Amino acid sequence: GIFGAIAGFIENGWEGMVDGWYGFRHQNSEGTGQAADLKSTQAAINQITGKLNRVIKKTNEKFHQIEKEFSEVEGRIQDLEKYVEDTKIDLWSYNAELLVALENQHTIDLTDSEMSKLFERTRRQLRENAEDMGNGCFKIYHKCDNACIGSIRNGTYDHDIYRNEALNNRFQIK
Amino acid sequence: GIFGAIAGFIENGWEGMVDGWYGFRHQNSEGTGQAADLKSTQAAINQITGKLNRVIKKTNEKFHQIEKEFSEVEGRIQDLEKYVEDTKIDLWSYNAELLVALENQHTIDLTDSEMSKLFERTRRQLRENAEDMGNGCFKIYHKCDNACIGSIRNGTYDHDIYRNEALNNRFQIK
Amino acid sequence: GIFGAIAGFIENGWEGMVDGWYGFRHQNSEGTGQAADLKSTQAAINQITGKLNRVIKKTNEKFHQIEKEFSEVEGRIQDLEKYVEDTKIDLWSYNAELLVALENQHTIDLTDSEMSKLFERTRRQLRENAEDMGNGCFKIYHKCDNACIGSIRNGTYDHDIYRNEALNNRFQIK
Amino acid sequence: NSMATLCLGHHAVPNGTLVKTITDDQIEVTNATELVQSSSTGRICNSPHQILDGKNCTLIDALLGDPHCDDFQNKEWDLFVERSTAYSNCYPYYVPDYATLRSLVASSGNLEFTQESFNWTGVAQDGSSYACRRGSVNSFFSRLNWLYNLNYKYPEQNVTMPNNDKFDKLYIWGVHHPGTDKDQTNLYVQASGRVIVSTKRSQQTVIPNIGSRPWVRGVSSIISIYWTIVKPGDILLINSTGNLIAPRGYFKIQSGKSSIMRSDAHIDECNSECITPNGSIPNDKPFQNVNKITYGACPRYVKQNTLKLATGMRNVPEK
Amino acid sequence: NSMATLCLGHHAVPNGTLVKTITDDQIEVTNATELVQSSSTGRICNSPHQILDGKNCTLIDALLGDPHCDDFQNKEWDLFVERSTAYSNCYPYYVPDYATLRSLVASSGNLEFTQESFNWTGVAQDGSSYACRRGSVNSFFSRLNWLYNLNYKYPEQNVTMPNNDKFDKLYIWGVHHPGTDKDQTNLYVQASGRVIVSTKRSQQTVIPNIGSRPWVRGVSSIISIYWTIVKPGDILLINSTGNLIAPRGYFKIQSGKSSIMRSDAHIDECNSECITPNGSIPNDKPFQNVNKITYGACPRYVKQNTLKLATGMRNVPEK
Amino acid sequence: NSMATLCLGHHAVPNGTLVKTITDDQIEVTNATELVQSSSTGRICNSPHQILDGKNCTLIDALLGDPHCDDFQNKEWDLFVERSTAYSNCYPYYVPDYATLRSLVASSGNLEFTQESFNWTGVAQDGSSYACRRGSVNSFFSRLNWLYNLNYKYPEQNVTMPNNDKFDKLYIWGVHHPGTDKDQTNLYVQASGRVIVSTKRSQQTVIPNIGSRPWVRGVSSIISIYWTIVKPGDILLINSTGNLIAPRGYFKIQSGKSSIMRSDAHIDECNSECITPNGSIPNDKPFQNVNKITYGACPRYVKQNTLKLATGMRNVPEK
Ligand SMILES: *[C@@H]1O[C@H](CO)[C@@H](O[C@@H]2O[C@H](CO)[C@@H](O[C@H]3O[C@H](CO[C@H]4O[C@H](CO)[C@@H](O)[C@H](O)[C@@H]4O)[C@@H](O)[C@H](O[C@H]4O[C@H](CO)[C@@H](O)[C@H](O)[C@@H]4O[C@H]4O[C@H](CO)[C@@H](O)[C@H](O)[C@@H]4O)[C@@H]3O)[C@H](O)[C@H]2NC(C)=O)[C@H](O)[C@H]1NC(C)=O
Ligand SMILES: *[C@@H]1O[C@H](CO)[C@@H](O[C@@H]2O[C@H](CO)[C@@H](O[C@H]3O[C@H](CO[C@H]4O[C@H](CO)[C@@H](O)[C@H](O)[C@@H]4O)[C@@H](O)[C@H](O[C@H]4O[C@H](CO)[C@@H](O)[C@H](O)[C@@H]4O[C@H]4O[C@H](CO)[C@@H](O)[C@H](O)[C@@H]4O)[C@@H]3O)[C@H](O)[C@H]2NC(C)=O)[C@H](O)[C@H]1NC(C)=O
Ligand SMILES: *[C@@H]1O[C@H](CO)[C@@H](O[C@@H]2O[C@H](CO)[C@@H](O[C@H]3O[C@H](CO[C@H]4O[C@H](CO)[C@@H](O)[C@H](O)[C@@H]4O)[C@@H](O)[C@H](O[C@H]4O[C@H](CO)[C@@H](O)[C@H](O)[C@@H]4O[C@H]4O[C@H](CO)[C@@H](O)[C@H](O)[C@@H]4O)[C@@H]3O)[C@H](O)[C@H]2NC(C)=O)[C@H](O)[C@H]1NC(C)=O
Ligand SMILES: *[C@@H]1O[C@H](CO)[C@@H](O[C@@H]2O[C@H](CO)[C@@H](O[C@@H]3O[C@H](CO)[C@@H](O)[C@H](O[C@H]4O[C@H](CO)[C@@H](O)[C@H](O[C@H]5O[C@H](CO)[C@@H](O)[C@H](O)[C@@H]5O)[C@@H]4O)[C@@H]3O)[C@H](O)[C@H]2NC(C)=O)[C@H](O)[C@H]1NC(C)=O
Ligand SMILES: *[C@@H]1O[C@H](CO)[C@@H](O[C@@H]2O[C@H](CO)[C@@H](O[C@@H]3O[C@H](CO[C@H]4O[C@H](CO)[C@@H](O)[C@H](O)[C@@H]4O)[C@@H](O)[C@H](O[C@H]4O[C@H](CO)[C@@H](O)[C@H](O)[C@@H]4O)[C@@H]3O)[C@H](O)[C@H]2NC(C)=O)[C@H](O)[C@H]1NC(C)=O
Ligand SMILES: *[C@@H]1O[C@H](CO)[C@@H](O[C@@H]2O[C@H](CO)[C@@H](O[C@@H]3O[C@H](CO[C@H]4O[C@H](CO)[C@@H](O)[C@H](O)[C@@H]4O)[C@@H](O)[C@H](O[C@H]4O[C@H](CO)[C@@H](O)[C@H](O)[C@@H]4O)[C@@H]3O)[C@H](O)[C@H]2NC(C)=O)[C@H](O)[C@H]1NC(C)=O
Ligand SMILES: *[C@@H]1O[C@H](CO)[C@@H](O[C@@H]2O[C@H](CO)[C@@H](O[C@@H]3O[C@H](CO)[C@@H](O)[C@H](O[C@H]4O[C@H](CO)[C@@H](O)[C@H](O)[C@@H]4O)[C@@H]3O)[C@H](O)[C@H]2NC(C)=O)[C@H](O)[C@H]1NC(C)=O
Ligand SMILES: *[C@@H]1O[C@H](CO)[C@@H](O[C@@H]2O[C@H](CO)[C@@H](O[C@@H]3O[C@H](CO)[C@@H](O)[C@H](O[C@H]4O[C@H](CO)[C@@H](O)[C@H](O)[C@@H]4O)[C@@H]3O)[C@H](O)[C@H]2NC(C)=O)[C@H](O)[C@H]1NC(C)=O
Ligand SMILES: *[C@@H]1O[C@H](CO)[C@@H](O[C@@H]2O[C@H](CO)[C@@H](O)[C@H](O)[C@H]2NC(C)=O)[C@H](O)[C@H]1NC(C)=O
Ligand SMILES: *[C@@H]1O[C@H](CO)[C@@H](O)[C@H](O)[C@H]1NC(C)=O
Ligand SMILES: *[C@@H]1O[C@H](CO)[C@@H](O)[C@H](O)[C@H]1NC(C)=O
Ligand SMILES: *[C@@H]1O[C@H](CO)[C@@H](O)[C@H](O)[C@H]1NC(C)=O
């Protein structure tokens, strides 16, 4: 997409994540795990549900119109009755083709955005205790048990407690 | 929006910034102030004025056309006269409805952009002397008087002279 | 554009680059060089070729239609044959006018996007061994010969073997 | 040095669908939905729209009163369905602006007939014909009154009829074209004549033309069918030397959602807002590919038979 | 503390507006402007377009030359405005394809009448009637010449009139259908006849039908109004046995921005390029909701009564 | 020296191109491609569409068989080209709804004529005229048979001709309108006359009007031209007591992609899918400003003369 996160610096998706659209995978001292993120998932879904309802509009509903098939050759007036209906169908076929094209381009780019937004939210939160590895993963430089991981996934991660521990693990003689 | 800054990590907008659209707000030892950014404000207005002028403007000038109302039952030819005009009205109603949805979706996204661009442009300036608190505010690790703050609102902020002081406040026995 | 990279934090473009759409200029002990990045150049081209091929798409083969120029005064029926063709032309003119403006707006944004992607690719690649000068350039804090530079542009820069040398230059007395 | 990794990722599916975008032509998202209804059941649901199956009767034959169409008298409808197997079994006729007369009656929505007493003096009424047999017994169109000679005489006729109600009134009448100058005198005694049917706002004048016509059900003659709308405060004014196929009354002409459609589709017990000639179709989708002829709340006909709208991110499965 | 905190942000307002987007139905921005014109003064501006208030005269009644329409001779317009209070006050007439004649005269944009002396012989000219009365004095359609018997004779006419100019000529002629057989012979001595009006390109034939018509203003007769256009180098050629309401000349007929509109709106002294039957509306918006009938540089008629184009960012306010 | 700088950038060109966007009216990009095709050679390419050069004959004149148009008999076309230098050099005629008969014959795509033998009796055939000369030798339309009296007798023709084939049949015929009552009786020894042409589905009746018409090639008469289509199982019934311009057979009517266009452009041995009255144009672009009249696979006509689609990024050169 235009944000380069889905099909971009995230090498692939997770078929095994069925409780959301965006989520966390972690590896720490107690083991490994996976957890969907509800905010980003609900953000993307509510946008796609919204545009979907505008598209299935619904309006129209016509009753007595013009005849559109003819069993006799008639000439001028019939040439017009056909040209009008033909003109209209091409114009609506165009609208329908362009609508799906524009919408799908936007459906992809917004789902790309929601991924990038969840990454930036996580980046700001970790502050100076983690480095971006480049694949949507963070290396967290301090002991971060399940409580610490959970405090990131919910938005209550206090970087200050781990800052001194993390800053030392980053700077030395590697 | 798609950049997640307005109605994003910026929790709300300053209802009392009457002199601009985007701007700064500070607190140093001297006092707390506020000032709008002319560059980002003018950028957003000129794009919105631009699309406004394309959307207003002529030209639809029509002078002798078909009769749109009828006091008599006439049948076939009036059926067609009605169908042609009704067909035209639905198509334009669609064009108008879709036009406003696309413009407004983009009017919102481009303003969200200009917020994020001013932020990133600022972080490129402070380089290694400040940290992103994640809410839209920077924490600056050196003494920055009002002339120093004012030097951030223009390209004049020379990070080289504050680097040694800032790094020490960032890294110490914490 | 909306990513603030082209005509943005990159002041201007390089008329000296003709073998790519995006690239690297570098400066080290051995001197200067210039190489185009194929992956990003190709990515922006494949999209523009895609939309160019969708826009130029065989459709619209019509044969016997209505008459559209008249050499007699006939009134009601001719008024309609003209209103029909006139209504149609205005509609396809609007479709044409809007299609160009959307595709052109998107083409600018998406090319601006690919420049930003390449920058964020290079930034993550350098980890903690360089800093953003703001002009679109990175200041690398270690000895990086032409071979080293090559590994950066080519996904093979191993930041670990320079991290100690780099951090020593970034923090010290200066 | 006990570190920890935290990875951000997304949603992926084994069974993606290809959608279409501004830049790519086929691209795999996790999920999409169809926007073009392309299938029908082949049957017309009997509700919500009040269907009136014409069967062997066309709307005009029912209007005029073809004896085998008597079961359509005073019938109302939301959609009249004309069938290809229909026929005519009464006197041979032809209607200039047939399409127009059929159009305005179809949109009226009813065949509600109201009789009126035209003061014909000196003429024998209720003319019959072998070509329009009502079971081996002779008769004519039910809503038309054939005037012929009474005691080897025909007086030049004149009658007024006003519209004193608050609604437009639709009058259907005709003019007889005998096939030989023999039949012309044996019916109206005169050699040829004029029929002048007028209102304050309209004017109609017909001259009969004697001459042979294609043999149909016994007779080589034909009737021409004409219609006249009389608005409130206006007048209908017949004036005729002969050859007049007189009206018996008016039809209430209304405006509403009513229409007509040609289709041989069977009518089934179900419910569907949208009707097409080849069957009822659903209208949950915004576009449809079944037929450009529709009636009711329908999707808009388009040339495409499929347009998938993406409802998910790009699918990037197991690499 | 060696501290300083720099915050970046965006402005906001208390009173934001809701707008439609691709994603959301109602979302609050800081400022939007309306794109649909939905109001009018109720009055028509008489500039920059040259308006012609028809008053009690229809464009057809001015064309033919009604007495009370005398004030429209040789007049021009850009927008002719027919009123609902209009009436006729001359001989009863009817016009086949009235809609077409009105349409073509309206687009022509003038009534500039040129006199022409046709060479009628043996026939009384300037016939008048009790219906078309210019005071107590009986007179007739100003642009029409009623031909009738002279010394109890009417000789079959034949008269030419070539178009020796460079522009199109428009002739408005007619045919008389009298109520009685007696009136036919008092005016034209002979029985019903043929009026044959052809050109090199056109061809028109009318057969007068004597009959009783709706009694109007003293007469139970009627006049069928027809028209003819003569090309440069072409020739108008009349051949009438009788029953001819002959023309006094031609109208010049060229093309341009002229048209006609039914409306009862008063006319003030303002300036608005866009006219609707409801009055003038300002064309500063690209769409409008007043009327589908428009004349001039107008916004395009849509079905919505409001489309708010957002001209600001999201409104995010308080907590 | 412990230092190395890596700059990232994008290219530029010295000469951009201005394009339109949603935001700007003009903005510079490195590249664009035109979308409006607004030029042509001025020459219709004779392939891949079967072109037929009408030269001096309107399609109606070739249909009827004007002598100077005998080349065009039994021709086929995908596009018939009518030239402004066309003249008519036979008997004078006019066609009510000329436009329709021109439209339907042009859409049928051929002039394949099949001769049939009607059993005319007591009547002289192959009537010729001084106005329609085939080499200073009097003759007439090649597809019309002029019937007149034989030995002071014109027995009432009555003849049927059924369509026992798959293809529909198109018959062309006419009614002669003599100038004087003398010409009427000299040709048909009976005043007036009558022509009744019937199918089971259609009925055309014409009464010839005697009267002087504009002098053309020595005659003051004229011929009305009529057409009639007969579907399989149907019948063609002609009943004339005089003044019939009989047919000689039927035209084979088909339904295809044939049409007709007015131009004076020359025809070359090139090849182009799209045809305009200005010569062929390339259909590589999606829109065209050449003409709203097109034939075949063409770009859609728009009003803009240029619409540039950006094919590159913003062009930002030396500051
Ligand atoms: C002007 O020119 C036209 C055209 O030529 C001419 O019109 C012709 O008129 C005659 C009049 O009789 C008519 O004759 C036939 O009509 C019937 C044809 O019916 C079908 O026959 C076949 C299939 O069924 C098929 O080939 C045909 O195409 C058609 O579909 C037919 O009834 C007639 O046959 C009669 O023969 C004797 C006559 O008594 C009887 O033994 C028959 O039963 C039948 O008629 C009698 O039947 C019933 C029995 O109960 C009886 O009650 C009734 O009274 C009737 O007398 C003929 O074959 C032509 O069809 C018709 N042609 C067209 C094209 O219309 C005009 O007559 C001419 N004008 C003048 C003034 O002469
Ligand atoms: C064929 O069939 C038609 C149908 O009937 C028939 O036509 C009919 O003809 C009669 C007589 O001509 C006509 O009768 C009167 O119609 C007028 C309309 O009536 C109402 O409207 C008026 C207001 O708009 C007003 O008068 C009343 O409200 C009225 O109720 C009516 O006006 C006429 O009245 C005049 O008739 C005679 C003529 O002398 C007098 O009795 C009256 O006073 C009146 O005016 C006379 O007096 C004044 C006094 O000074 C005098 O100045 C004036 O000049 C005049 O002489 C009509 O009589 C029917 O309307 C009409 N039917 C229609 C139209 O449907 C044909 O006659 C039939 N064909 C044949 C050959 O017989
Ligand atoms: C009702 O009223 C109409 C109109 O008032 C009337 O129609 C008129 O009828 C007359 C008689 O037929 C006719 O008169 C001559 O018109 C011909 C056209 O003239 C045009 O030619 C010019 C040059 O071509 C051109 O500039 C103009 O457009 C001009 O108007 C004219 O050719 C005829 O005259 C030739 O023919 C006669 C007959 O032989 C000869 O006597 C003449 O000398 C002349 O040329 C002769 O010489 C040439 C050698 O050069 C020779 O080769 C040739 O054979 C010929 O003999 C016509 O006489 C009017 O044109 C016509 N007008 C209209 C409008 O139709 C009706 O007749 C009236 N109805 C009744 C029942 O009476
Ligand atoms: C188109 O424009 C032309 C140009 O003006 C018009 O032409 C004119 O037509 C009229 C009518 O056709 C012509 O007058 C007739 O001339 C003929 C010439 O032969 C003449 O026979 C006829 O008189 C006959 O008609 C009378 C009708 O009342 C009969 O009663 C009478 O017949 C009886 O009388 C004789 C006594 O002599 C007895 O022997 C018998 O008892 C007989 O039965 C009489 O013979 C008319 O006078 C006129 O000449 C002509 N003008 C020109 C310049 O050619 C067309 O009329 C016009 N057509 C339209 C408008 O449709
Ligand atoms: C909804 O309702 C509509 C209306 O019926 C249906 O749409 C029609 O579908 C039929 C197919 O079932 C279409 O008919 C086909 O198209 C062509 C039309 O025939 C042309 O060619 C002949 C001469 O060859 C001309 O005379 C004629 O005027 C036409 O120009 C043909 O190509 C097809 O012929 C095929 O069938 C015959 C046997 O039947 C074979 O022998 C042939 O070789 C050939 O293969 C056929 O006739 C029709 O055009 C459609 N549109 C209409 C009628 O307007 C929908 O199918 C129906 N259902 C749905 C779900 O939409
Ligand atoms: C600019 O000029 C135009 C032209 O007149 C005006 O448009 C008219 O607007 C009025 C009011 O909106 C319309 O009048 C009303 O329409 C009602 C519904 O219309 C349909 O429904 C009935 C079914 O009952 C059909 O029979 C009918 O033919 C219509 O198809 C009618 O019901 C109204 O009747 C009256 O009675 C009811 C009582 O039930 C009252 O409550 C109503 O108020 C009303 O007085 C009435 O007919 C009218 O149809 C419009 N005309 C046209 C041509 O569009 C604009 O209003 C005017 N101004 C502006 C700003 O645009
Ligand atoms: C259509 O074409 C047909 C061709 O068949 C044509 O039909 C013919 O019509 C005429 C008149 O309408 C018929 O003539 C009649 O013939 C019968 C047969 O015996 C006679 O009895 C009639 O005599 C009466 O008519 C006289 C008229 O002056 C009276 O004076 C006399 O006293 C008699 O009452 C009359 O002559 C003719 O028979 C038919 N043809 C055939 C083959 O039967 C018809 O006219 C055409 N219609 C058009 C062109 O409109
Ligand atoms: C509309 O309806 C009216 C009302 O009936 C009708 O008017 C009537 O027409 C008849 C026919 O013209 C008139 O009756 C006439 O009466 C006079 C009395 O003086 C007679 O002279 C007439 O007889 C003629 O008949 C011969 C032919 O057989 C002629 O050659 C001869 O010369 C005689 O004149 C004729 O019978 C009647 O007077 C009028 N009016 C009324 C009130 O009856 C009119 O015909 C209808 N309009 C149509 C049918 O178009
Ligand atoms: C146009 O017609 C109207 C009818 O509505 C005339 O208005 C009336 O005319 C009478 C007679 O002069 C006056 O007494 C009334 O006061 C008028 N107004 C009404 C009845 O409301 C009008 O005079 C006619 N002529 C014009 C407008 O020039
Ligand atoms: C934050 O993490 C804690 C674990 O310490 C958990 O109990 C809580 O539910 C999380 N917050 C939310 C909003 O779920
Ligand atoms: C900011 O930069 C420009 C150029 O010097 C000017 O607006 C202003 O003087 C500067 N402000 C400070 C505080 O230097
Ligand atoms: C990328 O890897 C190293 C960089 O020095 C080099 O050996 C290799 O050739 C590079 N790739 C290409 C295509 O040259």
Numbering used by the authors:
A (entry chain B), B (entry chain F), C (entry chain D): 1 to 174
D (entry chain A), E (entry chain E), F (entry chain C): 8 to 326
What does the paper say about this structure?
The trimeric HA protein is critical for facilitating virus entry and infection of host cells and is the major target of neutralizing antibodies. The HA can be divided functionally into three major regions: (1) the receptor-binding subdomain (RBS), (2) the vestigial esterase subdomain located lower down on the HA globular head, and (3) the membrane-proximal stem region that is responsible for the low pH-triggered membrane fusion activity of HA in endosomal compartments. Here, we describe the unique human mAb H3v-47 that mediates very broad neutralization of H3 influenza viruses by binding to an unusual conserved epitope on the side the H3 HA head domain. This antibody mediates inhibition of virus replication using multiple molecular mechanisms including inhibition of virus egress and mediation of ADCC activity.
H3N2v viruses have the capacity for efficient replication and transmission in ferrets, and may pose a pandemic threat similar to that of the swine-origin 2009 pandemic H1N1 virus. To further investigate the antibody epitope, we determined the crystal structure of H3v-47 Fab in complex with H3N2 A/Minnesota/11/2010 (Minn2010/H3v) HA, at 3.57 Å resolution. Initial phases were obtained by molecular replacement using high-resolution structures that we also determined for H3v-47 Fab at 2.57 Å resolution and Minn2010/H3v HA-LSTc at 2.90 Å resolution (instead of the apo HA form at 3.15 Å, see below). A total area of 1061 Å2 is buried at the antibody-antigen interface (511 Å2 on HA and 550 Å2 on the Fab), where the heavy and light chains contribute to 61% and 39% of the Fab buried surface area, respectively. Major conformational changes were not observed in the Minn2010/H3v HA upon complex formation when compared to the apo form of the HA, except for differences in a few side-chain rotamers. In Minn2010 H3v/HA, there are only four N-glycosylation sites in the globular head region (at positions 63, 126, 165, and 246). The only two glycosylation sites N63 and N126 in the HA around the near the epitope do not make any contacts in the antibody-antigen interface. Importantly, three H3v-47 epitope residues on Minn2010/H3v HA, Q122, D133, and V144, correspond to the acquired N-glycosylation site residues N122, N133, and N144 in recent seasonal H3 viruses.
